[PDB]
Symmetry: C2
Subunit: 298 residues, 2 copies
Amino acid sequence: MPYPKKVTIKEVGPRDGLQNEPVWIATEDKITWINQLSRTGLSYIEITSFVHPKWIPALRDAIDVAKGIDREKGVTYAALVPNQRGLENALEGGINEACVFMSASETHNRKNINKSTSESLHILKQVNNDAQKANLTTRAYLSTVFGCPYEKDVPIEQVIRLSEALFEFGISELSLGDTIGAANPAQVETVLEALLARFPANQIALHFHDTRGTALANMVTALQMGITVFDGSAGGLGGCPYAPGSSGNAATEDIVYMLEQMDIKTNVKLEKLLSAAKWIEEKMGKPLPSRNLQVFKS
Amino acid sequence: MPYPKKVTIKEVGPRDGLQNEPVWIATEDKITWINQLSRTGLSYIEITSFVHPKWIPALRDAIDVAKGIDREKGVTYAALVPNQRGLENALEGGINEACVFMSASETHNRKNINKSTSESLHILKQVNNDAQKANLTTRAYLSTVFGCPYEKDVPIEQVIRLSEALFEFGISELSLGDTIGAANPAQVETVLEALLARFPANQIALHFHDTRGTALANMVTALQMGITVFDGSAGGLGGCPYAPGSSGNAATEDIVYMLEQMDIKTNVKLEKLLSAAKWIEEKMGKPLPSRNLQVFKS
C-alpha cells in the first residue's frame, strides 16, 4: 500500500534519446554530456547502442563514446546490444551491462529488426548466454507491451509468454515499455497485476513514453503495484517516430522531482540533472519537453 | 477502490487561461473560440471574469463576451465574480454560475486581492448570498491549498477551517487548487483524506497546475479518493506567473484523453476539443504545452 522508500531510475537519454533526435551531436559533446550525467547521482546510464551504424547514424560513434566517457564508480554503464557481433564491440567498449531487445508484437518486431518473435527470442537467448559468460550483467527491453502501432491491441498472454522465456534465459531485469505511448493507469494496473503475479517485482522495470503526457500518471500506479525501477530520458530527449513533434520518454528530471516530493529516494541530485538537461537543450538548439527544465531556466 | 464511471471536467481556459497569457485575443475571436467549446461536449465553461478590467486587461471585454457567446443547452456558463459590484455585471451578462474566490494562505490572499482571509470570507459570504438569491448557482475557488509561493507550507487545519466556512455559506462546490503547482500524489492523498472526511466528495473539485508536470498524476490519486470534478484549460493555456515560461493548468484534452482510455465517461468529444485547442494556439502564434494537441497536429 505505502509508496516504496527508494526507487532506482535508469537514464537512457544518450541512447534512446539521441538516436531519436533528427540532429547529430558531435561525438565529443556526447562524452561531455555523459560525463555530467555520470556525476549527477544516477547509478545507471545507457551510454550508447551497438546496432550497426547504418540504421542508427546518430550513434555511429558508439565504440568511440564508450571509451571516451569518464566512467564513475557505482555507476552502471550499459549499451544496447543487437547480437553477438554487437556484444563483441560492446565488450571492447567496456560496457558493464548489455541490454538485448525485441518486440512483443509480431508485426512491430518483424518491422523493426526484421525477425519473428521466435527468431529474436532465439537470438537474445544466445546473445544473453555469451554476455553473462563474459561476466556482464544483462537486461531485456520488451517493447510494445502496452499496445502496438500496427497491431494496435496486444494480448497479455503474449507478454507473459515472452516474459517467461526472457527470464528463463537468465536475464536480470525485464524492462517493459510503452512504445506508442498509449497506456493509462488502468491498463498498467491490470497488466502489472497479471505480470507481478508470476515474476518478482524487483526484476521488472518500466519505460513509459509520455507522448500523451500520461507517463508520470502511469508511474504512480506502478509505484503502487511495487515496481521500483523506472527508465527516463534527461530533458525528455527523443521524439516519438510514430507521432513526430511530440515528446518521447518521460523527462528524467520530472521523474526524479515528483519522486522526491513524495519522499522517495532516488539518490539523484536533481539540481545537477537539470543543469545537464539544459546543456544538451542548448546543443540541440531546440527546446526539450521537460517541465522542470523550463522551471529551472526560471 | 474501482475508478468512478463518470467524471465531470470543467473548462476554465477562456478565463484562467486567457488572463494568464501576455497576449490580447480579439474580443470577437474569444467568442468564436468559446462557441467551439460550447459544442464540444463540455457541460461547464467559465466564459470570463468580472474583476475590474484594470487588473485583468486581457479580459476587459467580459460583459461583451458574456453576451456574444452562442450559449448551448445543457451547458453551464460561469464567470469569476470578485464582489457584489461584479455580481451585478455578471447578472447582466447572463452568467448561470458565479465563482467566488480567495486564498487559503493569508500572505497570498492579502497580496492578490488585498484583504485578510476573514475580510474575504466576509465578502464571499454576502457575495454568495446575493448570487443565490438571484437564482444563480455558486462555486468557490480556494487557492494555494497545496502550498503557497510566499508562505511555502500551508497547514491542513487552515483549509478545513475555511472550507467549513465556505460550505456553511451555502456554496455548491469548493474547488481546491494547486496554485504554485507543487503538489504530489502523496500530498493530494493526505489532504483529500482529511477533507473528504468532513465534506461530501461530490461537492469538491480539483484545479491542478502541471507546472511540474504532475497534474495528471495527482489526478489519478484524486480519482482514487473519490473526487469526480476536475478543472482544465483547453490546450494548457495560461502560464504560471510564479514561474514564467512554464505551463499552467493541465491541458483539458490531456485530461479528457487519459480518462477515456481508463474507461471513464466525460461526455467530451475529444476530437472536437483538440480541434478547438489548435485554433487558439494559432491565434496565440505560440505553441501550447498540451501533449495530445501535438499528437493531433500529427
